[PDB]
C-alpha cells in the first residue's frame, strides 16, 4: 500500500532566475522572476509592479536570458532547466487570452562530461548570433540562433582550459568573442576566444591572456563605448581591454565577496554590485575623450550605496528603483535616493515581497485549540532569519444598507451610535466631522435602517419620527409607532423600512403610491423576519414568500399563503437555529440553518413545495450564529458569526467552510469598498477590529534559526538560533546587529565545567548559539540562553521524560573547532522553563555530535555521530544509557512511531530499527540498500517509509511482508519514486485544514507537510490502489491533452533523477497536474476522460463524465 499524492500548498518563493527587458511588448518594461519552477512576468507600471502572467516550468530554471534577434519586435526568452531542457519562449497576447509559446526546444545534455563546479553558465551574443553554454568541464556548447533551428541543434567546442570560472560575451567585437576567467596550477587567468560557427571552433582572440587575482569570481562585459571586461575578485577590481589595464583595491570590498551585478546605464558608466552581507555597492566607470572620436576609461571607483537584503539579484528597473532578489530572505523593491539620510544610506526600501526562504525546521501547532492547525517555520538565514507563521484562512457603530446612491450604491454617509445613543456622522467621503445638530436628538440608538427612494432617510427613535436632514427633508416613509418599541430581532431591506415595534401590527408599507397588506391576520408572536430574500440583484420581486416556521423547522417546506404545517420531520437540533437567512451564491441558493451550539442543517430550495435536499454537518463554537449574506462580489456568500466564523464559498455542489482571518466578531456589517474589501471600518463588540488562501506572519529575528519546538504546558516556542559575531582582540567579541538573542527580556549564559576541551585571529567570525523561549501570543523573545563557546546546538526536543511530571526543553549540542572534520564532544542539556527563566537540570556529556533527538516512549533517544542511543530519565533526574546501535555512518535524521525507529544516513538510505522491551536493545528489522544521500525522512504507515534525496527527489520504501522467511525480510524495497525538484529540509505530520468529518470515506489517508529550501510547502497523502490507478490514468490523459510551456514531457520532468540512475517515477501522483484539470476548458475537459471507466455507485464502471471527474478533483483539492 504505497500510493502517494504530492501537491504544493505554497509555491516556491526564493528567487534564483532573474531578468528585465521588453518581453510582453516593445514599449512596456518587464521584470521576469524565476523561483525554481515558477516564472512570473511583471509590467512596470505607474502604480508599481503589475502581475501579468505566472507559468510553471517542468524543471528548475538555471539560466534565463532576454535577447532580441534582428527583426523581432519584442524580446524572446531563453530558459534552460536543471535537466538541460533549453527552450525559447515568445509572449503572445490574443487580445484577452494570454499565452506564451515555445518557438524552439531541445535537450542539450551530453552523455559524456563532468558538470562544472561553478554551475551552469548561459550567455547570449550581443548581436544574438548564438547562445553559449558552459555545462561540462572542457567543453563549450554553442547553439546557432538561426530561425531554422527550431530543434535547438548545438555543437560542442573543445577548449584546453578545463576549469572555467565565468564566461561572458564581449561588446563591440566584429566576430563573436568570449572572455572568461579560468583556473590552472599557475593560478587564475583571463582569456579571450573568437567563436567561429562556420569553422565551429575557437580562434586566437582579440587580446592577450593576463594573470588576475587568485580569487577572481565573475566577469562583466562592458558595452560599446568602453569595451573590454571587468573582473571583480576579492579585494580587487580590474578592467581589461587590449593594452588598457585598470586596477583598484578598495578597502570596503574586501570584507565580503561580490555575488551579483547589474548594469544601470546602457553605456556602462554605472553598475550595481551585490554582496553576501547584503550591502549594495555602486561601481563607477569614469570616462574621458581623447580630443575627438574614441572615448576611454579613466578610473574605476566603487561606492557603498547602502544595505539591502542578502541579494541573489540586483536589477535596476527605472526611475532610481532597484529590484533586489533575495534567496535567503524577503525580496525587495528599493529606491536609490540622490542624497543620504541619518546613518547615511542611499537605499530606502519601498516594497517587500515575502519569501519563506530556507525552511530549516517547522512545526504544526494548534494555538487556538479549535481544530485547525497552523504552521510555524524557521525561515531565512544570517540577518534575514525570521519565524514565519502560515495559517489557512480568508463611538462609531451601526448596521444598515444605506442606499445613498440609488444606482452607484456603496456608501458615503453613515450614522455613529453609542450603546443607547445615536447621531448621524458626516462622512463626506474620506473625512468626518463631529458637530452637534440642534434639530436632532442624540439620546436614543438605532440598530437597523434603510433607504427606499429619493434618498429618503428617516431618523428612527422610540418616541416618534422626526427628521432634520438635507437629502430627504421629508418623512415620506413614515414608520408607525404602535407601542414605541426598540429595534430588536427586526430585519429591514432597501424596499421597506420596517422594525419590530408593538403587537397590534398591520403590514407596514407606508410609501408613496402603494400600501400592501400581506400581514393582515392578528399575530401575537414577534417574527424575527417579515421580509423577503431576493434571488440575485432583483429588488421587490420575491420568487417565493416561503421562509418556514421558526417554531419547529420542519424539513418539508411550506408556502406562506397556505400556512399549513406539512409532515413532521424531527431534527437532532431541537433548539431552534439562531438565524436562518437565504444566501445566493454565483448561481446557487441554499437553505442553511445556523444553529450555534451544533447540528447545522443545510437544504436546497426547489420551486413551490421544494421537497428536500441533502444535509451537511459541521460543528461550531458555543456562540450564537448569525447568517449574514454580503453583496460584494459575483458570489454573494454568507458570513457566519460563531466563535470561529465560516465564510462559506460555493463550488459546483459542495460549499467549503473558509475560516476568517481575524479572532472573532459577533455582529458586523461589511463594507463593499472595491478598493480594499479586506480593510474596512468594522468595529467590534467593544473595540474597533478592522478585519488569499494562505496568510504569512513574519517575526524577524536578525539571526539564523535552526530548530523549533512547541510546549503547550508553558505555551512557548523553543527556537535554536545562531548569531554571527566578529571577534576583536579588544573587548572580547562584539555583536554585528542587535539581533533577537541579544534583545531578550531575561538572558542567561551556559556554565558547564565538564568541557575543559584555541585562540582565534583578531577578525575571525565566530558563531554564538542560543536557545530562545518565545511567547506564543506576542511572539516576543521571553528568554535567551547562550550556550558555551564554540558550541553549536543542532537538535531540540520538548517532551516529558519518564515519570517526571515536568515538561523539559532538551537540546543536543556539539563542540566544534576549526581543525576537526567531525565533532568529538557533545552535550544533551535539559532545561525547565518554570517562570521566565530557563533552569538547567542535566548535562549528559557525550562523545560526538547530537544531530537529532526524539522522545521515544517516555525515554529520550539521541543520535551521536555514527550511533543511535537510548536514554532513561532516572528518578535522580539524570539520563542513563540503556542501549546503543552502531551500524551507521551518521544518524542524521530520526523518526519514530510506536516501537519502530527510522534512521537516516549521510550516504546510506533509511534504516528501520525496533526497540525490544523484553531484552532491552535495538534490532535491525530491515535496511534499504540503495545509497541515497538523505536530506529528510518520515514514517508514513507501519510499512511505508518516506525519504528525501539531496538531489531533489522523493522515495517511499516498503517493509516487505509477502516475502518468504529469509534475509529478504531485511530489505526495504524502494517502491515509490518521484522527482519533486525541491530540496526537502523538514518533514512533519499535520494539516492546515479543519480536522473534522475526516472519516467519511476520504480518498486520502494521513497528511504529511514537507518544507524545502526554496520556501515551498508540500502535502504528501497516501491513496488507495483503485484511486491511485484512476489518478494515474487521469495524469496520462492530461499529459496527452495539455501542453507544457516549454514543451517538456511531464514524465521526463517527474522521473527520478540522480547522477547514476534516471528511473521513471512510480507510485506517486502529481497533485499539481491533477488539480490543473480544473483549469482546462470544457471541450478540453471532454477530450480527457473520453473513454475512461469510473466505478462510483458500485462495481459497475460507467463511462465517466466530466462532472464526476470534477467532483473527484475538487474532493482531492479540499485537503490541499
Amino acid at each position: 500500500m504505497s500510493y502517494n499524492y504530492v501537491v504544493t500548498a505554497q509555491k516556491p518563493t526564493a528567487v534564483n532566475g532573474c531578468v528585465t527587458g521588453h518581453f510582453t511588448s516593445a514599449e512596456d518594461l518587464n521584470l521576469l522572476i524565476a523561483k525554481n519552477t515558477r516564472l512570473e512576468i511583471y509590467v512596470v507600471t505607474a502604480e508599481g509592479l503589475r502581475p501579468v502572467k505566472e507559468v510553471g516550468m517542468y524543471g528548475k530554471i538555471a539560466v534565463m536570458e532576454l535577447f532580441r534577434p534582428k527583426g523581432e519586435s519584442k524580446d524572446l526568452l531563453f530558459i534552460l532547466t536543471a535537466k538541460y531542457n533549453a527552450c525559447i519562449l515568445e509572449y503572445k497576447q490574443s487580445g484577452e487570452s494570454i499565452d506564451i509559446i515555445t518557438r524552439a526546444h531541445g535537450n542539450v545534455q551530453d552523455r559524456i562530461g563532468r558538470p562544472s563546479e561553478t554551475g551552469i553558465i548561459g550567455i547570449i551574443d550581443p548581436e544574438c548570433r548564438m547562445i553559449g553554454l558552459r555545462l561540462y568541464d572542457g567543453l563549450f556548447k554553442v547553439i546557432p540562433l538561426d530561425r531554422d533551428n527550431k530543434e535547438l541543434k548545438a555543437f560542442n567546442i573543445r577548449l584546453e582550459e578545463l576549469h572555467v570560472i565565468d564566461v561572458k560575451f564581449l561588446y563591440g567585437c566584429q566576430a563573436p568573442t568570449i572572455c572568461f576567467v579560468y583556473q590552472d596550477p599557475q593560478g587564475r587567468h583571463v582569456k579571450t576566444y573568437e567563436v567561429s560557427l562556420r569553422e565551429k571552433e575557437f580562434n586566437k582572440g582579440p587580446w592577450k591572456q593576463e594573470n588576475v587575482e587568485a580569487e577572481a569570481s565573475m566577469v562583466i562585459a562592458v558595452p560599446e563605448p568602453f569595451g573590454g571586461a571587468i573582473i571583480i575578485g576579492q579585494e580587487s577590481i580590474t578592467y581589461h581591454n587590449g593594452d588598457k589595464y585598470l586596477a583598484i583595491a578598495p578597502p570596503i570590498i574586501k570584507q565580503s565577496t561580490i555575488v551579483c551585478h547589474n548594469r544601470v546605464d546602457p553605456n556602462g558608466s554605472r553598475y550595481l554590485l551585490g554582496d553576501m552581507e547584503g550591502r549594495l555597492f555602486m561601481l563607477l566607470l569614469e570616462k574621458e575623450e581623447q580630443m575627438d572620436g574614441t572615448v576611454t576609461l579613466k578610473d574605476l571607483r566603487v561606492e557603498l550605496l547602502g544595505e539591502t537584503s542578502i541579494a541573489e539579484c540586483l536589477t535596476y528597473l527605472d526611475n532610481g528603483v532597484v529590484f533586489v532578489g533575495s534567496r535567503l530572505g524577503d525580496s525587495q523593491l528599493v529606491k536609490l535616493n540622490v542624497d543620504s539620510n541619518e546613518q547615511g544610506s542611499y537605499v530606502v526600501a519601498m516594497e517587500t515581497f515575502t519569501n519563506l526562504g530556507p525552511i530549516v525546521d517547522m512545526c504544526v501547532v494548534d494555538l487556538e485549540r479549535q481544530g485547525q492547525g497552523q504552521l510555524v517555520t524557521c525561515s531565512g538565514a544570517f540577518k534575514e532569519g525570521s519565524l514565519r507563521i502560515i495559517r489557512n484562512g480568508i463611538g462609531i457603530k451601526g448596521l444598515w444598507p444605506l442606499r445613498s446612491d440609488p444606482n452607484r450604491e456603496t456608501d458615503d454617509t453613515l450614522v455613529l451610535s453609542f450603546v443607547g445613543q445615536t447621531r448621524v456622522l458626516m462622512l463626506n467621503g474620506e473625512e468626518v466631522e463631529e458637530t452637534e445638530l440642534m434639530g436632532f436628538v442624540d439620546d436614543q440608538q438605532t440598530f437597523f435602517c434603510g433607504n427606499v427612494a429619493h434618498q429618503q432617510l428617516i431618523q428612527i427613535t422610540s418616541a416618534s419620527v422626526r427628521l432634520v436632514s438635507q437629502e430627504p427633508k421629508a418623512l415620506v416613509s413614515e414608520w408607525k409607532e404602535p407601542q414605541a418599541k426598540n429595534i430588536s430581532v427586526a430585519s429591514c431591506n432597501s424596499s421597506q423600512v420596517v422594525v419590530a415595534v408593538g403587537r397590534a401590527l398591520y403590514y407596514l408599507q407606508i410609501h408613496p403610491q402603494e400600501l400592501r397588506q400581506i400581514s393582515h391576520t392578528e399575530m401575537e408572536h414577534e417574527v424575527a423576519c417579515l421580509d423577503i430574500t431576493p434571488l440575485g440583484d432583483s429588488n421587490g420581486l420575491s420568487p417565493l414568500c416561503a421562509i418556514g416556521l421558526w417554531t419547529d423547522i420542519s424539513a418539508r417546506i411550506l408556502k406562506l399563503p397556505s400556512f399549513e404545517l406539512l409532515h413532521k420531520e424531527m431534527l437532532g437540533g431541537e433548539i431552534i437555529p439562531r438565524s436562518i437567512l437565504m444566501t445566493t451564491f454565483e448561481s446557487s441558493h441554499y437553505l442553511l440553518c445556523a444553529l450555534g451550539d451544533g447540528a447545522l442543517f443545510y437544504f436546497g430550495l426547489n420551486i413551490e413545495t421544494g421537497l428536500l435536499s441533502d444535509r451537511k454537518k459541521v460543528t461550531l463554537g458555543t456562540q450564537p450564529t448569525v447568517l449574514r449574506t454580503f453583496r460584494s462580489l459575483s458570489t454573494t456568500n454568507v458570513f457566519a458569526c460563531s466563535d470561529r466564523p465560516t465564510v462559506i464559498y460555493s463550488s459546483n455542489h459542495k460549499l467549503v467552510f473558509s475560516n476568517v482571518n481575524l479572532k472573532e466578531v459577533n455582529y458586523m456589517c461589511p463594507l463593499n469598498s472595491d478598493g480594499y474589501p479586506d480593510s474596512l471600518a468594522l468595529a467590534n463588540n467593544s473595540t474597533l477590529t478592522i478585519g488569499q488562501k494562505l496568510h504569512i506572519r513574519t517575526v524577524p529575528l536578525y539571526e539564523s534559526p535552526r530548530k523549533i519546538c512547541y510546549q503547550e504546558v508553558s505555551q512557548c516556542f523553543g527556537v535554536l538560533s545562531s548569531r554571527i559575531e566578529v571577534q576583536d582582540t579588544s573587548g572580547g567579541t562584539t555583536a554585528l546587529r542587535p539581533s533577537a538573542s541579544t534583545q531578550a527580556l531575561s538572558s542567561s549564559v551556559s556554565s558547564s565545567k565538564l568541557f575543559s576541551s584555541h585562540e582565534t585571529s583578531f577578525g575571525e567570525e565566530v558563531e554564538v548559539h542560543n536557545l530562545l523561549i518565545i511567547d506564543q501570543h506576542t511572539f516576543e523573545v521571553l528568554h535567551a540562553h547562550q550556550f558555551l563557546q564554540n558550541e553549536y546546538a543542532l537538535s531540540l526536543v520538548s517532551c516529558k521524560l519518564g515519570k517526571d511530571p515536568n515538561t523539559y526543553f532538551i537540546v543536543g549540542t556539539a563542540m566544534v573547532y576549526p581543525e576537526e572534520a567531525e565533532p568529538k564532544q557533545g552535550r544533551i542539556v535539559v532545561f525547565q522553563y518554570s517562570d521566565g527563566k530557563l533552569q538547567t537540570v542535566a548535562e549528559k556529556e557525550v562523545k560526538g555530535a547530537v544531530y537529532s533527538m526524539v522522545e521515544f516512549n517516555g525515554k529520550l533517544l539521541a543520535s551521536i555521530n555514527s550511533t543511535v542511543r537510548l536514554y532513561e530519565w532516572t528518578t535522580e533526574k539524570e539520563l542513563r544509557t540503556e542501549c546503543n546501535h552502531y551500524n551507521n555512518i551518521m544518524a542524521l535524521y530520526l523518526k519514530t512511531k510506536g516501537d519502530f525507529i527510522l534512521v537516516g544516513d549521510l550516504m546510506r538510505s533509511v534504516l528501520l530499527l525496533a526497540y525490544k522491551p523484553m531484552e532491552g536493545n535495538f534490532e535491525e528489522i530491515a535496511r534499504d540498500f540503495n545509497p541515497n544521500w538523505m536530506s529528510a525522512v518520515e514514517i508514513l504507515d507501519d510499512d511505508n517509509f518516506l525519504g528525501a534525496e539531496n538531489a531533489f527527489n522523493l522515495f517511499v520504501c516498503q517493509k516487505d511482508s509477502a516475502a518468504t522467511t529469509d534475509e529478504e525480510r531485511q530489505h526495504l524495497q524502494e517502491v515509490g519514486l518521484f522527482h519533486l525538484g525541491e530540496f526537502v529540509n523538514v518533514f512533519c505530520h499535520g494539516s492546515l485544514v479543519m480536522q473534522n468529518l475526516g472519516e467519511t470515506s476520504t480518498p486520502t489517508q494521513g497528511s504529511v507537510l514537507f518544507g524545502t529550501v526554496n520556501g515551498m510547502i508540500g502535502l504528501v497523502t497516501s491513496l488507495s490502489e483503485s484511486w491511485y490507478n484512476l489518478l494515474l490514468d487521469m495524469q496520462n490523459r492530461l499529459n496527452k491533452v495539455i501542453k507544457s510551456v516549454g514543451k517538456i514531457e511531464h514524465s521526463f520532468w517527474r522521473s527520478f533523477h540522480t547522477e547514476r540512475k534516471t528511473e521513471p517515477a512510480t507510485g506517486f501522483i502529481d497533485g499539481d497536474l491533477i488539480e490543473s484539470f480544473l483549469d482546462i476548458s470544457r471541450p478540453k475537459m471532454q477530450e480527457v476522460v473520453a473513454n475512461l471507466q469510473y466505478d462510483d455507485g458500485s462495481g459497475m464502471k460507467r463511462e465517466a463524465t466530466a462532472d464526476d471527474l470534477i467532483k473527484v478533483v475538487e474532493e482531492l483539492t479540499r485537503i490541499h
Binding site: 518594461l29 512596470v44 507600471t45 505607474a46 502604480e47 508599481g48 544601470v264 546605464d265 546602457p266 555602486m282 563607477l284 561606492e303 550605496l305 535596476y316 527605472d318 526611475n319 532610481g320 528603483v321 536609490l336 540622490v338 542624497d339 542611499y346 519601498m350
Partner: peptide, 19 residues
C-alpha cells in the same frame, strides 16, 4: 548632488510617480 548618483536612467517620468 554630485554626478556620483544624480542622473539615473529613466524610461518615462511617470513610471513611479504614484507608487
Amino acid at each position: 548632488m554630485a554626478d556620483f548618483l544624480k542622473g539615473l536612467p529613466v524610461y518615462n517620468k511617470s513610471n513611479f510617480s504614484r507608487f
